[PDB]
Symmetry: C2
């Protein structure tokens, strides 16, 4: 099934870019990838399902290009910096999967299969941020306390990172993605002791 | 013109909530507000124009409920805190105008009149954040340098604030809006000396 699916998604991607969503028909997609409407529906159920799958595939490619903490090479002190430089580079490309993700997340989606796609991509991003953020804390924090601090830091980072995409979309000419992320790293470093102490009100 | 417009927007708001955008017809809107399709088109041009105007009106109500720095009362040291508490309160309601703003900003919009609406709302938010952020700096910063630092802080705040809405939409049950904004205020306080020093590389 995989290869047919890839071909459908490639064609729909190019078509939507060209014509927009509304003007792109299943028949246009067939014309471009050589698979009959019957075969397209069999794989994606609907046009909206195709868009959702195109968004997920973009997301998977994005995440695969960012090393997990264990995959990052070089000194363990600089693994955090390697991850971040890959994020910066991918984000500064302004990838279309993100536009699609934010759009689908805000739409009150007609096709009920879209929500699961949105949820999966979102949870992956949160888990990936969590992964790297755990390594910013001192290693002597009791694990439960660390889980709390990391969760909060992770939400802050995910929020800032979401906003960076909007800045790139709406202020493309004045937005330095590398610099925004540097500010995030700096904010996280500062917030760590704050969260450690405020949490001690437990 | 004002009062007819308000009535059209009220009706479309209720209708979209109920049926969704696609299922809401101009005729449904007429049925609900008592203004003929001819009069609806005269004011908004198209259905998309109605949605854009509904989004802007929501935004205007939102901004009007947040005091400018000069409007805030109480000690000038606590004006920043008053502004922020109103922001927290409005954001924690998860207002629909924001969903619409993010959606319209991500859509490749068919009606060319929508972009100007998006631009206006966005510029207002940036100016409002800028306004309050200027008061976080020491008063002895040379004005030009302050403009730079404030701009950067403003972009960071706008980005974090955008992300807070996504957290409220996608992690509603685990997102504390007051706490996220407290973290933003704390991050800004920490970033100020960082930006002052890094800027001294000019
Ligand atoms: Na994509
Ligand atoms: Na609205």
């Amino acid at each position: 099934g995989e290869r047919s699916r890839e071909s459908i998604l490639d064609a729909t991607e190019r078509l939507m870019a060209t014509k927009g969503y509304a003007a792109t028909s299943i028949s246009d997609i067939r014309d471009a990838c050589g698979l009959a409407p019957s075969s397209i529906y069999w794989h994606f159920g609907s046009k909206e399902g195709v868009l959702a799958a195109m968004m997920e595939r973009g997301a998977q490619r994005f995440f695969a290009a960012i090393p997990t903490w264990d995959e990052a090479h070089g000194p363990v002190e600089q693994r955090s910096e390697r991850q971040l430089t890959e994020l910066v580079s991918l984000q500064s490309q302004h990838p279309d999967f993100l536009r699609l993700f934010y759009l689908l997340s805000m739409e009150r989606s007609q096709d009920p299969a879209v929500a699961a796609v949105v949820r999966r991509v979102r949870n992956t991003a949160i888990a990936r941020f969590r992964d790297s953020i755990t390594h910013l804390l001192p290693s002597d924090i009791p694990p439960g306390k660390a889980d709390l601090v990391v969760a909060e830091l992770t939400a802050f980072a995910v929020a800032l990172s979401d906003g960076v995409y909007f800045a790139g979309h709406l202020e493309p000419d004045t937005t330095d993605v590398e610099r925004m992320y540097r500010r995030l790293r700096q904010a996280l470093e500062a917030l760590i002791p704050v969260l450690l102490e405020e949490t001690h009100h437990h």
